[model samples]
Target: MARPSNVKPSPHVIKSLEELREATASNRISVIVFTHPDSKRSKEIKEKLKKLAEEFPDVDIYLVDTSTNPEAREWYNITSVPTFVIEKGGEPLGEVKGPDIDKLRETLDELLARLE
Candidate 1:
């Protein structure tokens, strides 16, 4: 296990049709953890997100369980076990799948590959 000698702290920032509306209307889509219950990856992604939040305290983050509400997943076309999507100014900046924490963090800041 990795140990952090210097720890740090915190990202409203998805889940249903209603939840979708909020994100959509909020005009600031950022990050989302798409997953479902009773699965290993789901647990893994959520945990990663938690750690991500600690690294990014102010970044608003969201989560959507396809099992509970696929509508949210559908709107975003999130068809995977654990998908992490990033956005800017309500525009879908794309996603980084799996529990790839590094990718998520990279994608968030890099935001370079974004339709420049």
Candidate 2:
């Protein structure tokens, strides 16, 4: 049976930095947000990113749970609850730290524009 059109896929969870590296290695653009299930802010950020992911289905969107993936946290030098790392052509484009939804949205928009 065909999947429902309203069904949205959850964000991909990266267990290791290497996994993240491999995922974006060939993709034109990707977005990875560091988050933890324990934090309220992280939950909010994840939801917002989920909606954004739905809109930009082409852009790879992922989540790294810092609570479980400590190495990934250290590898990315992420010291905040919600840090968004944007990648283009396997290169780091930039990042936004915190629950700044507007900035996150703006960054995604700009990066996507560049892709086009």
Candidate 3:
């Protein structure tokens, strides 16, 4: 899917090292991908998140399908599903490695606070 042009995201989704370099160089919006298996809840969450993204256009969110992309496991060292990673400047700031919504929001809010 084509990401919205106005939405700034991490390099992983954009697949452009230089663009990532520039964005990170300026400390723009952070990159986060919600990784999960292909399940009913996962699909629901993805749709909810997509709507959330539309509402919060400033927040860059990507959905990583681990079921299809095996390399995602090796790249992110993901052993658990429904993981959330906060990436700043093409690097991982932190990760929520489980199915904890409150914890994920807390960590992400913390990261956003630090960026501000």
Candidate 4:
């Protein structure tokens, strides 16, 4: 079945930090930065986030491929892959480095709770 335009994806995807900024500004939303396939230990990180997102249907989990997204490198000041930066109103509130699964979920949940 075709997805409805008004129905948002379980984890709304994004391709760049600029988009992340826009989402935060317009929606007052936080982002979950999942790792790309090429990042070191990304496979595990991706799987973890996938599971987390499945559990949290309302959370927005996005995969960012820094290699493919050259502009995101400068936008998020991303020095390494698998970095999770939480933004609200286009400003970064916090970041979880590497595969901090628990922290990431906690951060996302906290932000979403605040939004509500």
lDDT tens digits by residue: candidate 4, 1-116: 12223224454567665764455555445464645666464365467767875677565556666555666667757665667777765566877766677776677778888877
Best by TM-score: 2
Quote model 3's TM-score. 0.57
Q: Rank by TM-score, descending?
A: 2, 4, 1, 3
The residue pairs in collision within model 3 are: none
Q: Candidate 3 at 66: error in angstroms?
A: 4.4
Relative to the true structure, how large is the alpha-carbon lDDT of every model? 0.56, 0.64, 0.55, 0.61
Estimate TM-scores for all models: 0.64, 0.70, 0.57, 0.68
Ranking by lDDT: 2, 4, 1, 3
RMSD of 4: 4.9
What digit string (tens of lDDT, one per residue) describes model 3 on residues 2-30? Answer: 23354553334544445443444434455
After superposition, the stretches of candidate 1 with alpha carbons farther than 4 Å from their true spots are 1-15, 40-42, 72-79, 111-116
Using lDDT as the measure, which candidate wins? 2
Cα misplacement distance, residue 15 of candidate 4 (Å): 4.2
